[PDB]
Write an enzyme that holds these catalytic residues in place. Structure first.
Site, PDB file in Angstrom:
ATOM      1  N   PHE A 136      26.437   4.026 -15.573  1.00 21.67           N
ATOM      2  CA  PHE A 136      27.090   3.977 -14.282  1.00 21.67           C
ATOM      3  C   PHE A 136      28.516   3.570 -14.738  1.00 21.67           C
ATOM      4  O   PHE A 136      28.651   2.523 -15.031  1.00 21.67           O
ATOM      5  CB  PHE A 136      26.224   2.743 -13.690  1.00 21.67           C
ATOM      6  CG  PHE A 136      24.854   3.005 -13.126  1.00 21.67           C
ATOM      7  CD1 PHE A 136      24.862   3.558 -12.208  1.00 21.67           C
ATOM      8  CD2 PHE A 136      23.811   2.499 -13.850  1.00 21.67           C
ATOM      9  CE1 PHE A 136      23.419   3.775 -11.438  1.00 21.67           C
ATOM     10  CE2 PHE A 136      22.551   2.711 -13.517  1.00 21.67           C
ATOM     11  CZ  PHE A 136      22.326   3.561 -12.227  1.00 21.67           C
ATOM     12  N   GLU A 172      22.033   2.052 -18.436  1.00 17.91           N
ATOM     13  CA  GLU A 172      20.600   1.655 -18.544  1.00 17.91           C
ATOM     14  C   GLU A 172      20.028   2.760 -19.498  1.00 17.91           C
ATOM     15  O   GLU A 172      20.236   3.735 -19.698  1.00 17.91           O
ATOM     16  CB  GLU A 172      19.950   1.891 -17.319  1.00 17.91           C
ATOM     17  CG  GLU A 172      18.491   1.820 -17.442  1.00 17.91           C
ATOM     18  CD  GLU A 172      17.701   2.253 -15.962  1.00 17.91           C
ATOM     19  OE1 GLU A 172      18.414   3.303 -15.566  1.00 17.91           O
ATOM     20  OE2 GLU A 172      16.567   1.736 -15.598  1.00 17.91           O
ATOM     21  N   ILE A 173      19.186   1.920 -20.297  1.00 12.07           N
ATOM     22  CA  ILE A 173      18.565   2.643 -21.593  1.00 12.07           C
ATOM     23  C   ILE A 173      16.902   2.894 -20.838  1.00 12.07           C
ATOM     24  O   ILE A 173      16.407   1.853 -20.681  1.00 12.07           O
ATOM     25  CB  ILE A 173      18.389   1.836 -22.872  1.00 12.07           C
ATOM     26  CG1 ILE A 173      19.811   2.368 -23.781  1.00 12.07           C
ATOM     27  CG2 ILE A 173      17.193   2.376 -23.677  1.00 12.07           C
ATOM     28  CD1 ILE A 173      19.827   1.697 -24.999  1.00 12.07           C
ATOM     29  N   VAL A 174      16.385   3.982 -20.847  1.00 13.27           N
ATOM     30  CA  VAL A 174      15.350   4.157 -20.271  1.00 13.27           C
ATOM     31  C   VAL A 174      14.258   4.790 -21.380  1.00 13.27           C
ATOM     32  O   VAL A 174      12.891   4.267 -20.883  1.00 13.27           O
ATOM     33  CB  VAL A 174      15.452   5.320 -19.343  1.00 13.27           C
ATOM     34  CG1 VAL A 174      13.969   5.724 -18.913  1.00 13.27           C
ATOM     35  CG2 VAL A 174      16.116   4.916 -17.989  1.00 13.27           C
ATOM     36  N   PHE A 209      28.102  -0.749 -16.884  1.00 13.54           N
ATOM     37  CA  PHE A 209      26.931  -0.974 -17.458  1.00 13.54           C
ATOM     38  C   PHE A 209      26.175   0.261 -17.491  1.00 13.54           C
ATOM     39  O   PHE A 209      25.959   1.075 -16.592  1.00 13.54           O
ATOM     40  CB  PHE A 209      26.107  -2.100 -17.034  1.00 13.54           C
ATOM     41  CG  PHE A 209      25.194  -1.740 -15.967  1.00 13.54           C
ATOM     42  CD1 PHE A 209      25.643  -1.568 -14.490  1.00 13.54           C
ATOM     43  CD2 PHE A 209      23.874  -1.861 -15.806  1.00 13.54           C
ATOM     44  CE1 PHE A 209      24.799  -1.120 -13.821  1.00 13.54           C
ATOM     45  CE2 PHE A 209      23.146  -1.447 -15.070  1.00 13.54           C
ATOM     46  CZ  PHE A 209      23.483  -1.180 -13.815  1.00 13.54           C
ATOM     47  N   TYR A 244      10.056  -1.354 -14.465  1.00  8.95           N
ATOM     48  CA  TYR A 244       8.794  -0.894 -15.082  1.00  8.95           C
ATOM     49  C   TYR A 244       7.683  -1.939 -15.101  1.00  8.95           C
ATOM     50  O   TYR A 244       7.953  -2.835 -16.177  1.00  8.95           O
ATOM     51  CB  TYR A 244       9.517  -0.257 -16.547  1.00  8.95           C
ATOM     52  CG  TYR A 244       9.949   0.991 -16.082  1.00  8.95           C
ATOM     53  CD1 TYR A 244       9.444   2.061 -15.842  1.00  8.95           C
ATOM     54  CD2 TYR A 244      11.206   1.225 -16.651  1.00  8.95           C
ATOM     55  CE1 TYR A 244      10.126   3.276 -15.596  1.00  8.95           C
ATOM     56  CE2 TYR A 244      11.981   2.451 -16.471  1.00  8.95           C
ATOM     57  CZ  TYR A 244      11.340   3.336 -15.598  1.00  8.95           C
ATOM     58  OH  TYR A 244      12.106   4.702 -15.688  1.00  8.95           O
ATOM     59  N   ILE A 249      18.910  -0.201 -11.488  1.00  8.92           N
ATOM     60  CA  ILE A 249      18.168  -0.030 -12.523  1.00  8.92           C
ATOM     61  C   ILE A 249      16.536   0.132 -11.809  1.00  8.92           C
ATOM     62  O   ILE A 249      16.531  -0.360 -10.647  1.00  8.92           O
ATOM     63  CB  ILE A 249      18.107  -1.184 -13.746  1.00  8.92           C
ATOM     64  CG1 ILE A 249      17.481  -2.393 -13.302  1.00  8.92           C
ATOM     65  CG2 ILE A 249      19.291  -1.179 -14.187  1.00  8.92           C
ATOM     66  CD1 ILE A 249      17.490  -3.495 -14.289  1.00  8.92           C
ATOM     67  N   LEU A 284      21.398  -2.494 -20.341  1.00 12.05           N
ATOM     68  CA  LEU A 284      20.270  -3.111 -19.529  1.00 12.05           C
ATOM     69  C   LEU A 284      19.083  -2.378 -19.709  1.00 12.05           C
ATOM     70  O   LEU A 284      19.113  -1.105 -19.551  1.00 12.05           O
ATOM     71  CB  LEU A 284      20.330  -3.500 -18.403  1.00 12.05           C
ATOM     72  CG  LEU A 284      21.540  -4.663 -17.932  1.00 12.05           C
ATOM     73  CD1 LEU A 284      21.695  -4.648 -16.582  1.00 12.05           C
ATOM     74  CD2 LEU A 284      21.084  -5.946 -18.491  1.00 12.05           C
ATOM     75  N   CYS A 328      12.856   5.362 -25.856  1.00  9.81           N
ATOM     76  CA  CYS A 328      13.487   5.159 -26.964  1.00  9.81           C
ATOM     77  C   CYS A 328      12.146   5.258 -27.875  1.00  9.81           C
ATOM     78  O   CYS A 328      11.134   4.827 -27.588  1.00  9.81           O
ATOM     79  CB  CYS A 328      13.996   3.706 -27.314  1.00  9.81           C
ATOM     80  SG  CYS A 328      14.579   3.738 -29.214  1.00  9.81           S
TER      81      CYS A 328
END
Lengths: 212, 339, 352
Positions: free
Chosen positions: C79, C86-88, C84, C157, C154, C123, C90
């Site tokens: 964004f 976002e990691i979704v 910031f 989850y 975000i 985040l 890994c």
């Protein structure tokens, strides 16, 4: 001995130095950001959410009327001008003034709808081949096999021929786009053409009156 | 223990001496034989240690300022050791490891100032180890008394500190904030898209490793071209979805209450006419759509004429202001504010 | 230099930042990443992963082998305007996990985002077994962002645990090793510039005659200059946390990792249920006991045992025995008793 900080990028730089800056040894060429519907409005969403929502069925049914495929049924709505004898001082002049503009707008809409329908008739036949070629591959995964089938080999050629030959006609970009206000003077009612549409409609009205 | 450090225990009293001044036996007869100050004060000897004729060394705890007037050598070394172990950026555990009741904010500010954001570069301090003003600017006794006072005060405050409030449920983002259940205006994406099943054909797709080109022909192998061809359709589906969203954004089709109210206030014939005219909105912009509709309604109202309704407003003793001027001028060009 | 670094320098591996433009290589890379993520996260539907990976807004940084084989990668959506990203996802292939690529990949990602844009904060919703890795990579479980910056943007989850990370400006995260090592070297040299431990002092003059008697350390010249005081000597031996902090931390990590502690990970919301607070006068969850322990309020282990027992009692009280809530609570009580019995010290605190 070696640099400990990051070196800021500059415009119009060589590729190798770009990789040196990034250290990742590659990168996308096109950002693909132009297809984004638009940047988020940058507001404050922490405000309490409404506690009464409306079901997706209602919203889908509410917006469905705005996207049904074009048909000759509504190609008859426009192309119709109404009665022009019984109503015919100030109000009569107003009505005679407005009917002509209405007719001009409808004529332009008719001029666009035809190309739109042609594109629709194209897409309804392209989608069938897309679906067939897509489904002829899921069987491969299901049976896990072996060489490609002749059907799967000959559907791709048919699809590619159809696209590269026919779709050249519909090359114009405006066949799938809705003009946007923010772009500026994108109105499809430019005076430079509305004048001539008005004159043609007046000529047709005079001819009809002479016949009538 | 997850910590990678080494714990040092005295050889006589078995008391931890790592974080305290200590004394070690320097005779070759004694190896790694560490005697704490009390043991070396009381002189309790063990094994081959001889406090009478063997020279000893005094291990100093090295307590005095170097970089920061509130921080000493041990604190800085512990900070950097924590950075090596706990990772540069983990402020909670590194603050815990340094000790002295420095909250994570304080350690972060101290590190930023001293090293990262400083009139300095990765060579620390002003010029060299030859600059020795700060060590001789305050006596060690005063600094240690200050440390003892601060530690005692902080311990008393913590013992008297109020209980920490229980963590509330984590603030779930719930992007459903809009007044359409399942709309994520923060992301501009719906949950159930136009062809949400379109991914049903590529959620099991796999590629043969290291392939992509024929070793002999130089052209994509038949399976590779077939596999690539089934994703162009997916890309086209995504683009169709994007065009859908672009159209829906304009014309403000997300305001259910307002549009329904406006239709409700409208009469029967006007409602029917507007309903018929709805579809072409894809091809015009908001202003053009409004002009088109308003023109149709104006035509119908004038035909009828030839709260109160438009037919009841046109036949009023005083005519409305927008009806005393030809819509299209003499030279055939419509007036800009046609509707 | 860990094996990942030498492998990279010798050309064995290589990284590539790819998005779904429509080329040939990009599609292979993205499909391989999808396969890895689908393997590692079996709970979520394959459709959702397929949609997220092949989207046109997300990016991806992947590690590829010389014969175009993908070992793992990370996915994020920046964004740009909110400062910031976002990691979704890994993941790294389990077979090749032993090499130790995770930190190297994270450093690559952080450096790339830092040098290509102007974001500051990451985040993420960490899994229930990646918390150690995320913590070691600089993240923290405490959030320091306002509720307006990251609410509605975000995506939640279920079963996750939100974390934060604040990048430190103007650093080259790939060269942390040498930079921090030099910083340590120079501070150590500064320290060695004074430390008198290099002076081998003679036996204390009181003991030179062969008699050993107590000697006040402040009397000696070297120690006196060292400023040693009894107060600091006694104070230096008191740990910041409680003496059992390591053992209770091990137990807490084991209990959180156990898949039998999901309902207590977070408290119950007042809005969702109203009678939960009215019926239970001492509503306790895991976060509350953790915070109270951090406050040192729990003087004795009996306090922790009572807190766990009261949590279980509240779970059984608000939820019927027939319902899975109470049965799961009893199973988790059994698991905690197993863990305690593995500890001889606390084995005798089980009532009959």
């Amino acid at each position: 001995p070696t640099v400990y900080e990051i070196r800021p990028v500059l415009p119009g730089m060589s590729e190798e130095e770009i990789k040196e800056i990034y250290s990742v040894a590659s990168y996308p060429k096109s950002d693909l950001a132009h297809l984004t519907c638009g940047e988020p409005p940058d507001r404050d969403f922490s405000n309490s959410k409404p506690t009464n929502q409306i079901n997706f069925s209602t919203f889908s049914s509410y917006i469905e009327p705005y996207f049904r495929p074009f048909t000759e049924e509504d190609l008859a709505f426009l192309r119709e001008r109404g009665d022009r004898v019984t109503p015919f001082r100030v109000l009569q002049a107003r009505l005679r003034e407005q009917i002509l503009l209405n007719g001009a707008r409808k004529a332009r809409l008719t001029e666009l709808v035809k190309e739109r329908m042609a594109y629709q008739e194209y897409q309804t036949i392209l989608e069938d081949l897309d679906a067939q070629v897509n489904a002829a591959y899921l069987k491969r995964t299901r049976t896990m096999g072996p060489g490609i089938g002749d059907l799967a080999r000959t559907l791709m050629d048919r699809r590619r021929r159809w696209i590269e030959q026919i779709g050249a006609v519909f090359d114009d970009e405006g066949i799938t786009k809705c003009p946007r206000v923010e772009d500026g003077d994108t109105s499809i009612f430019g005076r430079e053409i509305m004048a001539e549409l008005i004159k043609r409609e007046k000529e047709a009205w005079d001819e009809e009156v002479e016949e009538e | 223990s997850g910590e990678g450090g080494v714990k040092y225990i005295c050889d006589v009293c078995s008391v931890d001496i790592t974080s305290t001044v200590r004394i070690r036996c320097a005779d070759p007869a004694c190896h790694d034989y560490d005697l704490c100050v009390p043991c070396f004060a009381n002189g309790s000897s063990s094994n081959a240690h001889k406090p009478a004729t063997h020279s000893f060394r005094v291990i100093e705890q090295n307590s005095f300022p170097i970089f920061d007037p509130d921080w000493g050598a041990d604190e800085e070394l512990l900070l950097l050791e924590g950075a090596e172990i706990y990772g540069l950026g983990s402020w909670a555990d590194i603050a815990d490891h340094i000790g002295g009741y420095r909250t994570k904010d304080e350690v972060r500010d101290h590190y930023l100032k001293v090293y990262i954001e400083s009139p300095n570069f990765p060579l620390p301090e002003r010029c060299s180890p030859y600059d020795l003003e700060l060590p001789n600017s305050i006596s060690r006794e005063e600094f240690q008394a200050r440390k003892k006072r601060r530690i005692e005060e902080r311990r008393e405050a913590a013992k008297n500190a109020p209980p920490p409030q229980p963590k509330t449920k984590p603030t779930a983002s719930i992007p459903a904030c809009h007044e359409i259940q399942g709309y994520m205006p923060g992301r501009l994406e719906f949950e159930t898209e136009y062809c949400n099943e379109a991914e049903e054909a590529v959620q099991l797709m796999s590629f043969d490793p290291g392939d992509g080109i024929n070793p002999r022909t130089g052209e994509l192998e038949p399976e590779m071209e077939l596999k690539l061809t089934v994703m162009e359709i997916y890309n086209n589906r995504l683009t169709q979805r994007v065009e859908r969203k672009k159209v829906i954004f304009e014309h403000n089709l997300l305001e259910y209450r307002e549009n329904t109210k406006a239709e409700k206030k409208r009469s029967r014939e006007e409602r029917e006419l507007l309903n018929k005219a709805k579809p072409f909105a894809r091809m015009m912009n908001r202003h053009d759509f409004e002009q088109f509709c308003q023109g149709l309604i104006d035509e119908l109202n004038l035909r009828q004429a030839i709260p109160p309704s438009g037919a009841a407003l046109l036949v009023a003793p005083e005519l409305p202001a927008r009806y005393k001027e030809p819509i299209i001028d003499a030279n055939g060009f419509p007036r800009p504010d046609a509707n | 230099e860990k094996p990942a670094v030498i492998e990279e320098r010798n050309g064995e591996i290589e990284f590539r930042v790819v998005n779904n433009d429509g080329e040939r290589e990009s599609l292979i890379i993205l499909t391989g990443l999808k396969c890895i993520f689908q393997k590692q996260l079996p709970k979520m539907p394959k459709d959702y992963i397929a949609r997220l990976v092949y989207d046109r807004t997300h990016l991806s940084i992947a590690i590829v082998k010389k014969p175009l084989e993908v070992v793992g990668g990370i996915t994020y959506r920046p964004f740009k305007n909110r400062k910031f990203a976002e990691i979704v996802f890994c993941a790294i292939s389990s077979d090749q996990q032993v090499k130790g690529y995770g930190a190297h990949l994270m450093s690559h990602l952080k450096d790339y985002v830092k040098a290509t844009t102007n974001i500051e904060h990451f985040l993420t919703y960490a899994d229930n077994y990646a918390i150690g890795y995320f913590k070691k990579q600089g993240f923290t479980k405490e959030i320091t962002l306002d509720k307006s910056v990251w609410m509605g943007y975000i995506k939640d989850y279920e079963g996750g645990t939100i974390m934060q990370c604040t990048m430190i400006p103007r650093i080259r995260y790939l060269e942390q090793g040498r930079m921090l090592l030099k910083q340590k070297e120079c501070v150590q040299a500064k320290i060695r510039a004074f430390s008198k431990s290099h002076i081998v002092h003679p036996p204390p003059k009181q003991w030179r005659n062969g008699n050993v008697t107590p000697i006040d350390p402040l009397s000696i010249d070297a120690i006196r200059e060292s400023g040693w005081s009894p107060d600091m000597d006694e104070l230096a031996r008191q740990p910041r946390h409680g003496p059992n902090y390591n053992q209770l931390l091990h137990l807490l990590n084991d209990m959180q990792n156990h898949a039998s502690s999901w309902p207590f990970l977070v408290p119950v919301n007042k809005d969702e249920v109203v009678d939960y607070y009215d019926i239970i006068k001492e509503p306790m969850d895991l976060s509350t006991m953790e915070s109270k322990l951090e406050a040192d309020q729990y003087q004795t282990p009996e306090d922790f045992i009572r807190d766990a027992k009261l949590i279980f009692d509240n779970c059984r009280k608000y939820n019927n025995e027939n319902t899975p809530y109470a049965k799961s609570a009893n199973k988790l009580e059994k698991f905690m008793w197993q863990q305690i019995r593995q500890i001889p010290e606390w084995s005798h605190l089980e009532p009959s």
